[PDB]
Design a protein around this nucleic acid. Structure first.
Lengths: 121, 56, 120
RNA sequence: AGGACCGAACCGACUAAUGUUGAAAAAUUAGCGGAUGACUUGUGGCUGGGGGUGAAAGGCCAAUCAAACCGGGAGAUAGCU
RNA sequence: GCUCGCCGGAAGACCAAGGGUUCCUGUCCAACGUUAAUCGGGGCAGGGUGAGUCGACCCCUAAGGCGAGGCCGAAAGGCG
RNA sequence: ACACAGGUGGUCAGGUAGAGAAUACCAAGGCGCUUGAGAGAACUCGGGUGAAGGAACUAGGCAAAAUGGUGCCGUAACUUCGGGAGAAGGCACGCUGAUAUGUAGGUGAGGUCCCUCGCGGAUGGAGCUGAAAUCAGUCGAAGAUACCAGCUGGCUGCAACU
RNA sequence: AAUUCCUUGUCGGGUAAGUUCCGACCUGCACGAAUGGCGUAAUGAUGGCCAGGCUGUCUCCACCCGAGACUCAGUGAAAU
RNA sequence: GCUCAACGGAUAAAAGGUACUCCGGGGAUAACAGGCUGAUACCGCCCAAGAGUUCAUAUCGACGGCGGUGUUUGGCACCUCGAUGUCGGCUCAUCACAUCCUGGGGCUGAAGUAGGUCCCAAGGGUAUGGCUGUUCGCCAUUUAAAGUGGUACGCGAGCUGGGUUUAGAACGUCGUGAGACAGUUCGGUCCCUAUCUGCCGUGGGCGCUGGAGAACUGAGGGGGGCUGCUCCUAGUACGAGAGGACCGGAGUGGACGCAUCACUGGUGUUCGGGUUGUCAUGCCAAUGGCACUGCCCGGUAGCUAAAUGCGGAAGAGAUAAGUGCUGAAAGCAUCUAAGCACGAAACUUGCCCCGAGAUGAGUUCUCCCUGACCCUUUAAGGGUCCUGAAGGAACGUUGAAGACGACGACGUUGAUAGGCCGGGUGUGUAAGCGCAGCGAUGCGUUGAGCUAACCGGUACUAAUGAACCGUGAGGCUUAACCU
């Protein structure tokens, strides 16, 4: 979310704990956590995941403890901070299957595949 | 902190121009006893606006 | 900042303020007229008047609540026996503040806060 | 048994903050180190200045120390202000 | 006087050192007290300290000091 | 220099909880610290609580925050076989009742004998005090419920160590 | 290397990124055997580094409680 | 009889260290900063052998030349040694334009996309981290870009102290040694209560010409001026393809500023509850004090961001570079000389705020004051009595106003605070009694009881009527109007 933020991975190919090295989009953007794309290092990885430790690639935040605010004032708060790993050049999901809840805020462009694969929207 | 030159007796008086006391300019008179009192205060013989309110 | 905020600190902590107004309420109930400083009397209105409003209805729960907010059983007995019926008709305003002059040691605005139906 | 351990009194003084015309001519507050020993403490005594004493720092010798304090030579001298 | 708070292996009480009347009683509020003061350890008077058993004194000695004679040192003096 | 937040040797040491002279609250005793009254700006000091992220701060985790107790298990490299080592890590902690009208245990009254017959011995087992455990029940969000009370691990330099 | 100027030497590690650290190489400006050489369990208010935890250190401050600061009465300085 | 050779020769005869240092002076003399200069530096131009696929100037330019700046290395020693704090960082800035981005152009060796170079343009904007003390530098990752300089290489009576710049210690090297090092390493006291100017806020006094109560005009001044991503046009123009439009529209963000608290949150020592230890209220029960608010769990108002709203515009005028029209001097030519037209995020306005002390003190509306006497050195003036007006101030209750003033509401014809009534909220089934149980405890009365700054009401309390200030018709010169 912020820089120096550890996140869980929703998708399978992305592995375990990941850290946000940069908040992409914006000159001095401090905090971005709803549908935003963040540059990611892999701080710890299982070997079954395709990506490995020390590798930089993009991600999109899917779950935030801060939570989205709906238009009527509703706040959906998800426990845990989660990301879906994306390729640096393509920004397309590496993982074949997305796990856990997703929000309807991730309905734009390449995130349609994420909400298609993920069970609960 | 310190001054580089001594301030003048003139500038002392100009600073104390706005340091002056204010007169009372009015004293209310109670109806029952003729003593003048501070307005909305006890008359110092024990009367408010028209009645004896404290023994002392 | 102080916007729509009640409560006068009077340069003391909350425990001292509570203890001071408990003792002042006890003295005001006991003697029916006391001399205080003026803000002290003004917040003394706010502690003393709900005690008589509680003391209008006499029950063991209300005497226990009055003992909680005074810790003086003589004051509880006076509130529920001598006063209470006296102020039963009065819809608030048991306290009257009469401003006196100024204190000698410190120039403090002085006041006499008294019960309205004082026998003297 | 322990120049054992944890830890009060006790002895010291590691970091920070306040103070810095202070409450104080090195303190206070949070934490700190030793605390049965080469410990600490009271009461006396001894060592005197090119001297003492020093688990050593030019440390200490009365808020004074690469040579204390007091008086004398002394109105030293000062091509300098 | 009644309530409140504080300390309570002390901010309680007693000795030691040190101080020296600061003790108690009456009176006064000029200077003192970081304010007012009727109060005080302030001023000014008057009282108060009772020992065979407690300390000192005393009997003894430690570290050490002084040391007749003595030894040594230019005198002062050092050591004993 | 002061009616100064410092320094000053010994002695006594009540209750409850506690290993305790810690600490919390109280006894007995002594005090509120010789300027007060308001208002509740910035800023300063000492604290409290913080959404999300968490060392990105910074010269440096400086400071703060955390961990902290007792019992039972369990514990690595290396080692001078003492250590390391409270290594690290895990579990249980409150109340009420039963076991057991209060148990193990401690302290011991009558009584009973004996003797050089008194401050004697021996035998008793009434009363008093009483830790810990186990089992069931029960309350909160929480049971070392406050104060008090350790942060831990890996690699190195130097000096053996106090 | 508490020593290597060049030097942030070269490699491998740890990080996304490492003049620190750790381990090797020897090319020792300018190590070397009681002016002691090399290691060493334990120990250290020691020097350097890396983690877990934890948090207002930080992003970026916000509110609250007290002591000042403000006003009022009394006394009332300082450097220059 | 002297290399008394430092040769006008101190004495027969004399080396060093001080970071442990001390004294008297000196900016007579270095370090820092400022001043002069500008050799060097940086920037620009002159010529143009060349370099460029052929093709000096699309792009650079040898050999040489001339300038500009104060700006880097230096020179000097004017200043500062009876004192001008030293790098960096943090916070806060301001200026220049030799312009990094955004705007307007010219040339291109500019098919498009994307660039190069030059001109105009200073309105706004112009990263986060790792290493290390660093400015630097290397790197990792952003962005439209992460400008270049000045400001005592801005900023220590603003902060830091890693750095240097002390006293302790050690290593390498030099010296017999004390000690030394433009070596290294570990450790190592950064003070100010603001008089003046200056700002930022906020008042008092008098003026503006009789005194008031309002509402404004706008001379001036300040704030604000940023941009990305996607889609349409359009896969169109452009193109062999690959790629892919400096027009014109639409949304959506980032950073920034302003307001607000309806929501989501935080806080909430002034509400409710749980709970540990102890003490008290005689005791059980119920409560209270103290232990950081004892620890917590929640939380109303208020404040606030992390919440939501809003905005930096479009225009208009005059222009810069630039492009032109008509048009001579110069029958052709020519953007200029007379004329005429466009042309920028710059300028002036448009948006917001201040603002007549705008001494040039402005405008409009309304209210209010129309009595005598005496002296009299006459724009003239005094003294006395009578009368004090419109209004203000004081006092009091106060405010989502406030350091204090100031400002706003209300003052008995009164809702201005407190209290009271009802609600709302927040916390979570009070006490008491009864029942089940051996008891802890449970269950019922009971969503009970408490409740804050909140909402709607209510004269129960305090806002007493005086009094005070403020006046009495307002100066001299050129007009209609009638006397």
């Amino acid at each position: 979310i912020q820089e120096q933020t550890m996140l869980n991975v929703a998708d399978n190919s992305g592995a375990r704990r990941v850290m946000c090295i940069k908040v992409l989009g914006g000159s001095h953007r401090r905090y971005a956590g709803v549908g935003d794309i963040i540059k990611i290092t892999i701080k710890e990885a299982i070997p079954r995941g395709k990506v490995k430790k020390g590798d930089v690639l993009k991600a999109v935040v899917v779950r935030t403890k801060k939570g989205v605010r709906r238009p009527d004032g509703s706040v959906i708060r998800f426990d845990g901070n989660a990301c879906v790993l994306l390729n640096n050049n393509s920004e397309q999901p590496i993982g074949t299957r997305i796990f856990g809840p997703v929000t309807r805020e991730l309905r734009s462009e390449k995130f349609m595949k994420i909400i298609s694969l993920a069970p609960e929207v | 902190a310190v001054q580089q030159n001594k301030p003048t007796r003139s500038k002392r008086g100009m600073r104390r121009s706005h340091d002056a006391l204010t007169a009372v300019t009015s004293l209310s008179v109670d109806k029952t006893s003729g003593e003048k009192h501070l307005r909305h205060h006890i008359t110092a013989d024990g009367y408010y606006r028209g009645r004896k309110v404290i023994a002392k | 900042m102080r916007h729509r905020k009640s409560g006068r600190q009077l340069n003391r902590n909350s425990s001292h303020r509570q203890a001071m107004f408990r003792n002042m309420a006890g003295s005001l109930v006991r003697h029916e007229i006391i001399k205080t400083t003026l803000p002290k009397a003004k917040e003394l209105r706010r502690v003393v008047e709900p005690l008589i409003t509680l003391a209008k209805t006499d029950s063991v729960a209300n005497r226990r609540l009055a003992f909680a907010r005074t810790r003086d059983n003589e004051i509880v007995a006076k509130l529920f026996n001598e006063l209470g019926p006296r102020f039963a008709s009065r819809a608030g305003g048991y306290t009257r503040i009469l401003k006196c002059g100024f204190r000698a040691g410190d120039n403090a605005p002085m006041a006499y806060i008294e019960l309205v139906d004082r026998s003297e």
